[PDB]
Design a binder for this molecule. Structure first.
Ligand SMILES: *P(=O)(O)OCC(C)(C)[C@@H](O)C(=O)NCCC(=O)NCCNC(=O)[C@@H](N)CC(C)C
Length: 514
């Protein structure tokens, strides 16, 4: 979970009257002292509702260490250790067997480079990246009882690096290259394409990963390691890196041993499952939402991407609104989405899905892998509350849920036992997330670089709203919608309505949600 770290950050910022609080910054180095520690403790007790003391701040003076302290799980330890498929990976493999996802669970990473890179040096750099991170060369075979991992040696890991000439626009080409299917049993879950053309000034570097090997949080380590490996091979040298604290299989083995078995009543898995069974009781099968077409018998996973650019003034107003009411920016976006669905006639019981990153352990905080568990955040909007009252409801719902974020979502589905159907995702069909793209990626590969948005031809749910920060000040709302249900114009209107909800909430949080 990251919400604790963000809350401690804004409490640091407010108490210090300071606007450069990072996760690893020391409280006393930023200008804090003993008297100011009282305000940090008091504010963290009122916001997180956990017993915090002055001693906790002195022993854990950074927002990352303090957040971890405030939340018995063994640390990740290293282990030719055999690969261990995490429950995320098994569930991601499973969704490709249940549905034809059309590449919806491929994650893209597109970087425009002012110079056309050297394909041979790039291929060598990718081989080094694949050799460093075992999860990028871990195959998944379908056996009798399900998935079985196969780790390829670096010499046997045949990388997929190629140059593609773009006659067409270039943004449409990225969509289609992203959705190209992976054969998880034979091909490594990483494809690399270099797009050049007469309309492409320089080149566009596209990293297509299957989610089984990487989440959106892996963008920073992927780019950093690929940059250092490219600049080393360009200089005729193997990259010289500090060894990895752990591979993904180390994290997976540690997590599953600590999770325990669902039959053990005292295991963390069972105790968290019992919470979700009660928290998700009498859940709506599906929210009644106005769609352009009725739900088809099978979710085709066809989709589009509607974007809403946010003005910098609104982004800061959202930041100010979050710090004002003691909630994270995600909680404001999640409350705004709930208001939007409520005003569309969905009712007072709004279950929204949301990803929660399991990157608290410092050995996996900056590593490549999939750490996003899916949680059902069930917010109630009865009693015609104000947006401020809703922000308090959302925080109470989120913090209670974030304390049980380790139960695998597939196990949660199995315990809640909703009416199953391949026409819809279970327990929720609208997901909301807050994402931050990597910062300081403007001067990579010895050139000028910038992340490029990839329009998607796929969708995982009915609706997926993401508050995406680009890493260099800007922010925008992305709505990944199912084309089976919504036309592109309807999605564009939906995301513009979400921005209006936020603008109205920042202006006056005392207005009723109705
Ligand atoms: P943070 O680390 O920034 O601040 C710590 C703080 C507030 C400086 C405390 O450590 C603190 O208050 N230190 C001073 C404590 C102190 O000096 N107590 C003695 C006060 N004098 C007496 O009590 C009196 N009996 C002296 C006798 C005559 C020896």
């Amino acid at each position: 979970v990251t919400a604790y770290e963000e809350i401690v950050c804004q409490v640091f910022a407010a108490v210090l009257d300071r606007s450069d609080v990072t996760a690893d910054a020391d409280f006393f180095a930023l200008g804090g002292h003993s008297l100011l520690s009282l305000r940090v403790v008091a504010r963290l007790r009122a916001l997180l509702g956990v017993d915090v003391g002055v001693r906790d701040l002195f022993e854990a003076p950074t927002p990352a260490a303090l957040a971890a302290r405030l939340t018995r799980r063994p640390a990740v330890t290293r282990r030719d250790a055999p690969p261990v498929l995490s429950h995320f990976q098994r569930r991601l493999w499973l969704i490709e067997q249940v549905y034809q996802t059309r590449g919806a669970y491929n994650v893209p990473l597109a970087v425009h480079v002012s110079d056309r890179l050297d394909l041979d040096v790039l291929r060598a750099a990718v081989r080094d990246l694949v050799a460093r991170h075992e999860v990028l060369r871990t195959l998944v075979r379908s056996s009798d009882d399900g998935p079985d991992p196969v780790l390829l040696a670096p010499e046997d890991a045949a990388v997929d690096v190629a140059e593609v000439q773009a006659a067409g626009p270039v943004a449409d080409l990225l969509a289609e290259l992203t959705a190209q299917p992976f054969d998880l049993a034979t091909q490594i879950p990483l494809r690399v394409r270099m797009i050049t053309g007469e309309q492409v000034d320089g080149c566009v570097l596209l990293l297509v990963c299957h989610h089984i090997a990487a989440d959106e949080w892996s963008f920073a380590p992927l780019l950093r390691d690929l940059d250092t490996a490219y600049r080393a091979r360009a200089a005729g040298r193997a990259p010289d890196w500090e060894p990895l604290p752990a591979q993904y299989s180390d994290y997976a083995a540690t997590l599953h041993d600590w999770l325990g078995e669902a039959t053990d009543p005292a295991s963390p898995l069972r105790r968290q499952l019992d919470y979700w069974q009660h928290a998700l009781q009498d859940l709506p099968d599906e929210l009644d939402l106005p769609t352009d077409r009725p739900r088809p018998a099978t979710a085709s996973h066809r989709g589009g991407l509607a974007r809403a650019e946010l003005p910098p003034e609104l982004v800061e107003a959202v930041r100010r609104l979050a710090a004002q009411h003691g909630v994270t920016v995600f909680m404001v976006v999640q409350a705004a989405v709930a208001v939007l669905l409520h005003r569309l006639g969905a009712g007072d019981d709004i279950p929204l899905g949301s990803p929660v990153a399991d990157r608290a352990d410092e050995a996996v905080h900056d590593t490549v892998g999939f750490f996003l568990n899916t949680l059902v955040l069930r917010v109630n909007l009865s009693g015609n509350p104000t947006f401020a009252d809703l922000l308090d409801r959302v925080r109470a719902v989120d913090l209670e849920a974030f304390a049980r974020a380790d139960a695998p979502f597939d196990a949660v589905v199995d315990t809640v036992k909703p009416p199953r159907a391949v026409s819809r995702h279970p327990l929720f069909q609208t997901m909301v997330s807050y994402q931050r793209r990597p910062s300081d990626v403007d001067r990579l590969f010895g050139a000028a670089t910038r992340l490029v948005e990839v329009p998607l031809d796929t969708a995982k749910f009915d609706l997926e709203f993401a508050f995406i920060e680009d890493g260099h000040g800007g922010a925008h709302i992305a709505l990944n919608y199912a084309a089976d249900l919504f036309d592109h114009d309807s999605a564009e209107q939906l995301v513009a309505r979400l921005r209006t909800v936020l603008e109205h909430a920042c202006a006056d949080p005392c207005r009723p949600v109705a």
